[PDB]
RNA sequence: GGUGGCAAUGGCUAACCUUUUAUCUGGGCAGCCGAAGCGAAAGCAACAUGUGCGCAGCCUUUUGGCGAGGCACGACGUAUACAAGUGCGUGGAGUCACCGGGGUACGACCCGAAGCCGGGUGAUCUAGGCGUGGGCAGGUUGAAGCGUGGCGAAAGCUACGUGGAGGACCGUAAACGGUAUUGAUCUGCAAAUCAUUCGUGUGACCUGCGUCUCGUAGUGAAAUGCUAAUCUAACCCGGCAUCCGCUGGUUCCUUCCGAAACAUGUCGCAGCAUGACCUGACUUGAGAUCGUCGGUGGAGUAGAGCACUGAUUGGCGAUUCCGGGGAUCCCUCGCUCGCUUGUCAAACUCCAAACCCCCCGUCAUCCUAGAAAGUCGGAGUCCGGACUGCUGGGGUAAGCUUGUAGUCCGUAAGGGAGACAACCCAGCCCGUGGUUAAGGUCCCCAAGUGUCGACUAAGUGUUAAUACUAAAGGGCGU
RNA sequence: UGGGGCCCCGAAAAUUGACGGGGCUCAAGUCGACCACCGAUACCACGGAGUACCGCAAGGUAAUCUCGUAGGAAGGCGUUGUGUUCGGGUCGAAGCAGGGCUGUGAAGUCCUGUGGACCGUUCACAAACGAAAAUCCUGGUAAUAGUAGCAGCAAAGCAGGGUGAGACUCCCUGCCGCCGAAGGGGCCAGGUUUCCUCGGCAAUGUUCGUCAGCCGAGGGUUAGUCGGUCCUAAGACGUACCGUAAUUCGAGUACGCCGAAAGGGAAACAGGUUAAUAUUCCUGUACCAUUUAGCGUUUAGUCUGACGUCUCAGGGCAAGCCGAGCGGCGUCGUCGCGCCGUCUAAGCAGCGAACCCCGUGGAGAGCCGUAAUGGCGAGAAGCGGGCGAAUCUGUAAUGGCACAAGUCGGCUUCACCCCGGGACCCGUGAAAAGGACAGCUAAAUGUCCGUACCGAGAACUGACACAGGUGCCCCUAGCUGAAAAGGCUAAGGCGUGUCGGAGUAAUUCAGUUAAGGGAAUUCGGCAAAUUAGCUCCGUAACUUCGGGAUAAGGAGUGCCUGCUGUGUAGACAGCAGGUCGCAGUGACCAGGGGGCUCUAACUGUCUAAUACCAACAUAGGAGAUUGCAAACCCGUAAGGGCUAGUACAAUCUCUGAAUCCUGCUCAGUGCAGGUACCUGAAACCCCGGUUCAACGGGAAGAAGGGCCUGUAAACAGCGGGGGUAGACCCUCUUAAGGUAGCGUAGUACCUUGUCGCUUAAUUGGCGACUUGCAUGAAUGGAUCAAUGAGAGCCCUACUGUCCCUAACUGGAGUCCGGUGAAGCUUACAUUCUAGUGCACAGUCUAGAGACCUCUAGGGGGAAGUGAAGACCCCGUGGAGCUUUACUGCAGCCUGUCGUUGGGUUGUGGUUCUGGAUGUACAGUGUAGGUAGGAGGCAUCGAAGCGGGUGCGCCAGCAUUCG
RNA sequence: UCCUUGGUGGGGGCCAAAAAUGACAGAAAAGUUACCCCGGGGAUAAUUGAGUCGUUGCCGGCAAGAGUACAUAUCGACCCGGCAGCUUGCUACCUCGAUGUCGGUUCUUUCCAUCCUGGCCGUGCAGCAGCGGCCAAGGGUGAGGUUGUUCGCCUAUUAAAGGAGAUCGUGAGCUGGGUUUAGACCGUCGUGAGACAGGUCGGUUACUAUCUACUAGAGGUGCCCGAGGUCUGCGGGUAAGCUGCUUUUAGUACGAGAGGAACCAAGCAGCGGCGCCACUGGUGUACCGGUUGUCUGACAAGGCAUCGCCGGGCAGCUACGC
């Protein structure tokens, strides 16, 4: 048994690959709201989120609950965030995406209604509302795909704060090391051709090279799905 | 196999009971083997001797007779299903023990690895993640930002001060690391340390304590590195007395005999089986052939030869042929075919030995104190080597390699060659005496300064064989 | 002239050697013959043993018997025990040492001594039954050998006097020394009595020992305040649920519970006392918590606990320093200096710097601040107030000090305390208990555990009294100096772990110096040497504009006298003059530099114990999957990692900073998409078979495959020969035929390729050329400032690297006292030459040498020792790894069945009503199915007609609207 | 013939034929290891050793001929016969319970097939100087650049800068550059792991001497009137030195000139050997002085810092001196 790969170690869940969950502030999700209800809260602080490297807003709601929310661009302390079917379509409010006009920018989008917010959550970029239909609403993702979601799916109006974070080059190994200290990801990473054959399919040889094509079938079992997984194509665009 | 019990109206019991404490006595017929074989099966189913030879033994006129056992036939059962031939079987000897040998399976004469697998142990070391602490002498450099001032029409350009950034610089025997000396040490202070010299030394930094991640798993800035002096799969115990054709060992005496290192098959080539060869016993009962001489047969090797197959050298004579050279093919002429010369052959033979082989007779030797033959028990052995021949084959040759006949060493003493596995005498129970073999006789060293006739002047030589001994050529040396 | 014998030339090898050696010449050589003798275990003779065969025996025969490995066969000896026969022994059994006799022998018996209670023997039977070997095992014990070691630690001791049987080694005094930012002080983990006292010295201590961490006996650890205990952290454990064939196994959830002697935290100090404990006992002076009783009560939910890195201001302070007085000690050749001390806890009371806040104020052709950033009509300066520190002041005062003084000032102040500012993000830097906000008084209570001592060059760990390692300190005094570097000294701890020694030779480990030369040494400047601090001047190519840089290259530097400037000060900077030495960073400390290349961008990581590299990583660049009930991955499952995440994200790969770039090839393999057609298992269905099935076919057809398309920053490839001043049309092209670059390379076999510089000379380096055996673009190409314990070459300086060694220093060695191992070993052994021999002999053969013993010395030989060769082969021995080797198994894709229900339609017949609708030719009439081969109905029904209700040839049967 | 009996469908068997195992007396079967492990083997390879000598080095016989003529001053074709074992092969006898692998360095020794030095002979030898051969192994045979090199090339001296053997002498002497481990790069192979008598960077050299041998120093015993002194010399060893330059002979012999010798004589030099220390140089941790930092209160006198450092230096030892 040529040793298990890094992916198999991560699946095992050893401490080297676990997230430092104690370092994080909150599990950011939309406040739970009953059917046909609303709640208003005020932003009391803008804090740094170590799990995202983006700002988060601390919000005190009317019901006595203090909650961390994914902060949108321009959200400020003292702002009144409303969450409900009747909420004003304004930056920071939590409204169903059926009430958002086409061409509007949303973020923290629920995959299903009441899900808490799944899509469009990293620092800076957004989703666009494209079309509206009776049971379906279409949004262009940051990927470029079109996602048809329930119009009752909730989302905060605006973009995620922290745009341009990756614009500054890392410039330095330790610069990225300090970011990797707060995440589960292993840093740094050894190239597979630098390993021995027992450690990777690409390892070994008198000279560094994979020895086999790097595009691997989608049917390959765990321990073999390495390189370019089910690649539609390869190379730089012609 | 040796010794026994019983014996075709066969042998023995197993479990078990009888124990009165494992014995023992008497029971115990279930079963097994024998008693009928052949055939896949269905199935069918044989000699209580028809004949001959003949050992022992007996009788006998010493040549014959009877002749158990034995041998050879004949006959019959069944399968081959048509037939014919043939196979197996058939005229009652087995069975159960004790003491032995041997095969097979089991740890299987004893020890000897790496490994494979099960369940457990380990992150006090080391690697990495996390929590919470500690640490980094003293200096250097001087980013942005800010103040003031210059040069400019502005655009803008620019000096100094302040400021204190950086996986920045120097540097501590703080800490961490480990370059070079390939220094010390190298049964050490130390199962890797010491001295000097070096790299990092505000950061991907070092480090305490705590905690987590581990065996086909972990960890790894990736070397197959590290995971408790153990890492290309840790350690403990278990499978396990693993297995091996491979290595090592295997313990008292005498006596009798005494090999094979070879063939065929083998995933066989360091092994094994079968056979040859050794050994023991029994059966049988009259011949056998290691040697000689003569004869009937086989020769196709040596040698010889050119008569076949092919080579091969000139001379001579012809092919008015097939062909090389400068219009009547105007004439020059190599091969081809013969008579003579000169040479040849593993795979040529008109010839043709000596050895040798089969058979017959003969002598010779052995043999009823058991020929030849048969049956059974036990093996070892299939690494060989050498000398003398075969111009053995191959090779430039080889103390090379591979054959063959004999004999040796192996397993062979003693005597002699300086010593010498296998070269000479000789095969050798113990003691004594004598005479010899090989070889030697100037001394070492037992016996010749032996005899005769010559040669050698070179210390040549003083060397049977042997791989341990120098050639071609020349010499008015003798 | 030919044929012959012997000899000569031809004829050269390596330690001194071989006719066996001496030697030998009408021979002691050769040739032809001969004579006598010597000389085996052969042969003969005698005697004896065994063997084979025969014989009833007695005995007979053997020229035709007597070697022997593997191996077969026969008979015996011995050990221990069993049955059985017969015995021996305290008047001395077994065993043991030595000896006699017998037997071929295995062995038996006896004698002497020793020993003190058991032992044999006949015939048989058994076995845990016989040893010289296994790098055999266990135990004991040699040679080595009185040898190595008791030497870097680190200057290590000496004198005098004691103690004692005994003294280098134990005690005291003095002198001389070591460490002195650790070798001192405190303490974690760990140790576990090593701590203290007394008495010892058999062992331990690397010597001795009276000493001791050793031996024996006794003693020693005192807590409301110091820790644990309490809280929670990463993260464990328990119960429940669920899984699992099951569990002591398993993830998650819920509830609990633990998890820090360095995180948080209620509170105590000074002095004394013992031989050893002391914030613990005693004295004095305090403080905290609950509980009880009384006196009063919420402000309630906030704050605190509670936080990173770097940098800086202000204030304070332990330590430190200076001057005066006082009290001791030292010195005193002269002087009057030097050293020590000159003390004082918590608690209690008092003040309060900065920040912040409150009231006034009104500030701009701008004002106020800071070290710095800054602040301001959204309200500056100024003026009042509140809140609020370290520390300081008093008290605690009649404690300890020689009841000796004990009183004052000043400076500085880290590395400690308080407070405030700024910068960075890239880790945004914990939680909970507890505390505060309403408590005051008085009594009682405050349990349990630890507490000695070491904390390391002797108390831990590494087997050790081990030169390593082990938490470290938020521990460390004076001078020099930037300094905690180095040197010299305090305090404190030590002389603690073998001595002596006469030149103490040679040699060796580590150092000092070295004429002239200066890398000629060597693979190579390895090693050593040079330089070195600070100040000032000055600083190149190149460059990514940051740097290179301390580049390079120059000058100064000590002491004394008198001063100047900055600053509140500490101090710092500078000046003038005088002056000594070979030398002024005088010791200590402390870069050598430059030029040309390769390579990697850089800092970093690594083979703990041979590889610190160009390898790994890195930032940067590119590609791929995935919209989250995702991609990818773990688990048998329950359920998980990534994930308290969401494309700017995670995961999977390649390349490897910047700069200029990254060309052509999709034939092969891979990947993705498409599936028109072909192939494609099972189930269902159909046919046949089967009294039923098995079975044989058919249909349909998923995934997959064939097949088509795309894709090279996927794996990869980018080629042969000949006509033309080696270009160009063709080729060979079974996809294409090397673009930019680079090139004898870290790739170039030929090869020491050719030329130029570098040298006297260069298989070298660099540059150019390049016919590239076999360069080339993210299998990344070229190039590159800076960086580098990387790899080469050159220049300079330097030198014992060398020419070529010498002297000296300390430690070993040598000699002496004490202590005291280990490793090679079948035996013998004073060897040397040659030959022989398994062809590499101290032992064989023939010679030559050699009197023995001891000491020192370097290593020729003992094919020296260490070690079942790691190179090679073999073994139907292993292990890992690879793959289009064989065979499988997981994972994944897909069909079918179950889970799995209800509706709507589209597809096959399931099942049957209204007609028997049936008709080449003509029909009066439709075969009214094949039919009693003929025979029943009817105005209470039999037809010529409408689109003719079944049907059809606008006919005609059934009587229906007529 | 098919399990109680009979039958059906379907099986099993007997004899024969066909289908193949070519590794053909019949397994269904690809690699790699330098990350390797284990058991053995000198039954079998790298290396030294033994044999052989094709090959290599050095020769010989006959002399074909060349040499203005003339085989033999010089060269030596064709063929033939050898020696050595120093090149490379062949072989597998010894060693796989290890005989440490190349090259260099240090030190010793041997061979002659002689490079120089000594003595000779021939010459197509006038002299100078060559060419060829014979004897001769006493001495010498060096210094440097590249390369790990052996070998080879090159440089300047030199009388010449010969070759070879000693386990390709010499790792219980040294070195570690090369080759021969584990890491890594480049190129080429291979799909790959990996490989390359291709290149490149890096990469642990253990031991206290038992015996023997040698170098030196002692104690004995033997020999011997007891002791002492002085000698002899059986023997052993030696390189009881080797070799250049210059002057002279002599600008002579010789030669037409150019050029240009020899005997004898002298001095000097290189290397070697032996000894010595007046001179000169080094060292000189005896000693003397200067001075930095610090301590002993200052001065003086002292300690320490490598002898603190720096300067000088007698004796002694030494060579770079004699």
XYZ file of N, CA, C and O (backbone and C1' of nucleotides) in Angstrom, chain C residues 55 80 86 118 125 150-151 165 201 219 232 290 423 448 506 594 656 735 763 816 859 905 920 932 943:
175
model
P 29.024 -79.367 6.347
O 29.868 -80.133 7.459
C 30.630 -81.283 7.126
C 31.543 -81.702 8.251
C 30.897 -81.850 9.617
O 30.160 -83.045 9.771
C 32.935 -80.689 9.839
P 25.854 -46.152 36.181
O 24.298 -45.836 36.237
C 23.839 -44.497 36.323
C 22.394 -44.377 35.918
C 21.456 -45.410 36.512
O 21.089 -45.108 37.843
C 21.019 -45.196 34.209
P 18.944 -66.734 45.176
O 20.461 -66.251 45.215
C 21.523 -67.174 45.031
C 22.835 -66.464 44.819
C 23.316 -65.594 45.964
O 23.885 -66.339 47.027
C 23.570 -64.417 43.946
P 22.917 -43.739 52.106
O 22.739 -44.551 50.744
C 23.373 -44.144 49.539
C 24.660 -44.888 49.282
C 24.672 -45.910 48.160
O 24.644 -45.351 46.857
C 25.802 -46.795 50.010
P 16.236 -59.445 25.806
O 15.321 -58.304 26.439
C 13.985 -58.584 26.835
C 13.425 -57.511 27.736
C 13.494 -56.100 27.192
O 12.467 -55.855 26.248
C 14.137 -56.124 29.478
P 44.634 8.696 30.801
O 44.218 8.701 32.335
C 42.858 8.821 32.715
C 42.666 8.538 34.182
C 43.594 9.282 35.125
O 43.191 10.619 35.348
C 43.501 7.013 35.750
P 44.251 11.813 35.182
O 44.716 11.700 33.663
C 44.156 12.515 32.644
C 45.166 13.502 32.122
C 44.679 14.455 31.044
O 43.969 15.557 31.584
C 46.804 13.579 30.454
P 45.423 5.854 67.151
O 46.781 5.721 66.335
C 47.919 5.086 66.895
C 48.593 4.202 65.880
C 48.838 4.817 64.511
O 50.023 5.590 64.463
C 47.890 2.654 64.269
P 37.920 1.705 61.094
O 37.798 1.229 59.581
C 36.995 0.104 59.236
C 36.764 0.031 57.752
C 38.034 0.192 56.922
O 38.013 -0.756 55.861
C 36.415 1.789 56.253
P 14.792 7.928 65.818
O 15.016 9.454 65.414
C 15.165 10.453 66.411
C 15.707 11.743 65.846
C 14.808 12.520 64.898
O 13.795 13.261 65.558
C 16.976 12.423 63.996
P -15.097 25.420 34.903
O -14.449 25.281 33.456
C -14.908 26.092 32.387
C -13.788 26.910 31.803
C -12.944 26.225 30.742
O -13.570 26.246 29.471
C -11.531 27.283 32.304
P -17.223 36.199 51.821
O -18.117 35.150 52.616
C -18.746 34.082 51.930
C -18.573 32.769 52.648
C -19.582 32.445 53.734
O -20.819 31.988 53.222
C -17.408 31.927 54.498
P -0.902 55.876 13.978
O 0.043 54.774 13.323
C 1.210 55.152 12.607
C 2.150 53.990 12.404
C 1.523 52.720 11.854
O 1.327 52.772 10.452
C 2.928 52.177 13.664
P -6.149 18.785 58.321
O -6.322 18.202 56.853
C -6.958 16.952 56.640
C -6.876 16.542 55.194
C -5.485 16.534 54.583
O -4.752 15.362 54.883
C -6.962 17.664 53.140
P 64.033 14.090 22.341
O 63.661 12.840 21.428
C 64.498 12.452 20.351
C 64.032 11.164 19.720
C 62.709 11.217 18.971
O 62.846 11.722 17.656
C 62.716 9.351 20.413
P 35.449 42.777 -2.095
O 36.123 42.851 -3.534
C 36.576 44.094 -4.046
C 37.529 43.918 -5.200
C 36.992 43.168 -6.403
O 36.131 43.945 -7.214
C 39.146 42.379 -5.900
P 11.119 25.261 -13.245
O 10.706 26.565 -12.429
C 10.539 27.828 -13.065
C 9.986 28.850 -12.103
C 11.009 29.357 -11.095
O 10.688 30.678 -10.673
C 9.277 28.254 -9.953
P 1.191 9.455 -39.163
O 1.032 11.032 -39.019
C -0.162 11.718 -39.366
C -0.127 13.118 -38.809
C 1.115 13.925 -39.172
O 0.997 14.568 -40.428
C 0.758 14.039 -36.842
P 45.693 23.086 -22.187
O 44.734 22.056 -21.443
C 45.002 20.660 -21.426
C 43.728 19.855 -21.499
C 42.761 20.041 -20.327
O 41.422 20.040 -20.824
C 43.284 17.762 -20.559
P 60.350 1.891 36.131
O 60.018 2.651 37.488
C 61.038 2.913 38.438
C 60.533 3.750 39.586
C 59.187 3.348 40.158
O 59.243 2.205 40.988
C 59.214 5.667 39.857
P 53.962 3.943 13.184
O 54.570 3.217 11.904
C 53.872 2.152 11.278
C 54.800 1.057 10.824
C 54.105 -0.103 10.132
O 54.958 -0.688 9.157
C 55.120 -0.869 12.128
P -57.433 10.513 -19.028
O -57.064 10.146 -20.532
C -55.960 9.307 -20.824
C -54.891 10.051 -21.581
C -54.116 9.233 -22.604
O -54.775 9.157 -23.855
C -52.595 10.359 -21.201
P -65.907 -15.250 -54.647
O -64.947 -14.826 -55.844
C -65.464 -14.524 -57.130
C -64.356 -14.183 -58.095
C -64.790 -13.825 -59.507
O -65.249 -12.487 -59.628
C -63.040 -15.395 -59.615
P -73.969 -33.411 -43.941
O -75.341 -33.099 -43.192
C -75.665 -33.715 -41.949
C -76.711 -34.789 -42.134
C -78.044 -34.313 -42.714
O -78.599 -35.325 -43.554
C -78.424 -35.313 -40.619
P -87.062 -9.472 -46.261
O -87.222 -8.931 -47.751
C -87.164 -7.538 -48.029
C -86.907 -7.271 -49.492
C -87.002 -5.815 -49.931
O -85.821 -5.075 -49.667
C -88.216 -7.180 -51.435
